[PDB]
Amino acid sequence: MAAAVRQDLAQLMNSSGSHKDLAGKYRQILEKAIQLSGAEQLEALKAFVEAMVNENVSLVISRQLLTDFCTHLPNLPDSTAKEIYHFTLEKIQPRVISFEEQVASIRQHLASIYEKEEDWRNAAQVLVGIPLE
Question: Which residues get modified to N-acetylalanine?
């Protein structure tokens, strides 16, 4: 069902309702993305992340749901968590000045999946990228 995710996210990109009307609808598609299974889940989340970083989707919507997105990936296995995390860190890279609270929390969960699987190199290199000071 990875064809009604790009459909529903597209129409809400330009609406005429308040933040409660739109942020409530967008988080309902996060349900449609996470509930998928196999290799069909893997592309529906990529549709969700590109819509948030989009310039046609407001900044009040982008910092609200990428917070909820970052805590829905500790649920999934280490094969899908690491796949989707690296997708979220190079679509937020074009505008890394805006979502630094997301870039901080996303890169921390990524370094834990690395170290777990005997990766003592790339876990560190991701924490270097976190713009602390």
Answer: 2
